[PDB]
Design a protein around this nucleic acid. Structure first.
Ligand SMILES: Nc1ccn([C@H]2C[C@H](O)[C@@H](COP(=O)(O)NP(=O)(O)OP(=O)(O)O)O2)c(=O)n1
Ligand SMILES: [Mg+2]
Ligand SMILES: [Mg+2]
Length: 347
DNA sequence: TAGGACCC
DNA sequence: CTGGGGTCCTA
């Protein structure tokens, strides 16, 4: 037997959900992102359809920028409620296959399938794509491996509307020449730092001396980079439901704030909104964090612990406002955030 | 507790 | 010019 980890990922997820209720839009660049007004600054693309990516639009691109790259695009506001519902539908199908299923956010999931050696895991992936496409009309892609990060890499190669198997046998064949940020968990910064010490590919990283990595990145991350390069990863698929460690809301204002009372009032409001939401989820706050980002994109966060876990509005607002007040302010403010850390014990 | 990195 | 929302490890 083999413990396959299958990674299921919805294709161009938000655009697909839109397209599914808008046939007038097929074969057209559709871009999802922020009220649907491409002229608004400080708002980004959240999901570009494939047709739009052909113009170099991508998630995280400002709306103004996407409009410049793709002037004929149809821009639609983000409908979270339609997406939650489209996601739950896809999860229920995936969970109904009988395997352990570990759901991450709207779009993705790990399925664990312990299979006898004669059985092709590609058969389960084929079952998944069929059922998802037939019941929901969404297309997904499936990456197959024996750990999560490697399955996750496989899904990139399966894109779009396909299945790709990546194992110990072809791992290095396939990955060896690629830069390190091809690895899940390795982004641009690590790639840059690695290149500066002359490690420029997955193959290089995979044979780097452990001391070199642990000195440069830390005793755990250094060993982890080396495991990642060798094609290893997390391997247990848990069906246990995720319990959030925190909840948060941030706002980027249309115009930089300069008036203290305005800053006070946004932090109050975000503290209150987050608190109402956590209470509804039956949770209790332990710590309150405030984030301030200035016009220059300097972003600092302070945090204070409550004297006892609490849910009390007056206290949480008062704490968020005292934390705000520890920042040197006045200097124009681009963004304010409140994050509430939550009691892990009990609930 | 602060910060930086990554990912969706 | 550069969103919003999480989580993890390092100093
Ligand atoms: N920067 C990002 C990346 C993704 N997302 C949201 C919107 C996406 O449709 C959803 C899924 O992310 P994703 O799976 O990387 N990409 P998407 O499903 O849109 O297209 P594919 O490349 O998966 O086919 O997460 C986001 O809001 N911000
Ligand atoms: Mg996806
Ligand atoms: Mg995804």
């Amino acid at each position: 037997m083999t413990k396959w980890v299958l990674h299921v990922d919805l294709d161009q997820f938000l655009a697909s959900v839109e397209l599914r209720r808008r046939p007038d839009l097929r074969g057209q660049p559709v871009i999802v992102g922020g009220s649907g007004d491409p002229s608004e600054p400080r708002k980004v693309v959240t999901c570009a359809s494939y047709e739009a990516r052909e113009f170099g639009v991508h998630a995280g691109m400002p709306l103004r920028a996407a409009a410049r790259r793709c002037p004929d695009a149809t821009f639609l506001p983000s409908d979270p409620a339609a997406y939650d519902e489209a996601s739950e539908q896809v999860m229920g199908l995936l969970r109904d296959l009988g395997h352990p299923l570990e759901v991450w956010g709207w779009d993705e999931a790990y399925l664990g399938a312990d299979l006898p050696d004669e059985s092709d895991p590609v058969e389960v992936a084929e079952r998944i794509r069929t059922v998802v496409a037939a019941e929901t009309g969404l297309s997904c892609s499936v990456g197959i491996s024996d750990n999560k990060q490697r399955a996750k890499v496989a899904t990139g190669f399966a894109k779009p509307a396909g299945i790709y198997v990546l194992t110990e046998a072809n791992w290095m064949t396939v990955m060896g020449d690629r830069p390190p940020d091809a690895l899940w968990g390795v982004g641009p910064k690590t790639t840059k730092k690695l290149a500066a010490m002359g490690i420029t590919t997955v193959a290089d990283l995979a044979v780097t001396d452990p001391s070199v990595l642990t000195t440069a990145f830390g005793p755990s991350t250094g060993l982890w980079l080396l495991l990642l390069a060798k094609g290893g990863g997390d391997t247990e698929v848990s069906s246990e439901p995720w319990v959030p460690r925190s909840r948060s809301h941030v706002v980027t204002f249309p115009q930089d704030l300069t008036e203290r009372r305005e800053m006070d009032s946004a932090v109050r409001d975000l503290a209150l909104q987050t608190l109402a939401e956590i209470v509804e989820q039956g949770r209790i706050v332990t710590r309150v964090a405030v984030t301030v980002r200035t016009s220059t994109f300097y972003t600092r966060t302070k945090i204070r612990k409550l004297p006892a876990p609490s849910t009390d509005a007056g206290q949480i607002v008062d704490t968020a406002l005292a934390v705000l007040d520890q920042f040197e302010l006045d200097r124009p403010v681009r963004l304010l955030g409140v994050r509430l850390e939550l009691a892990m014990d009990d609930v």
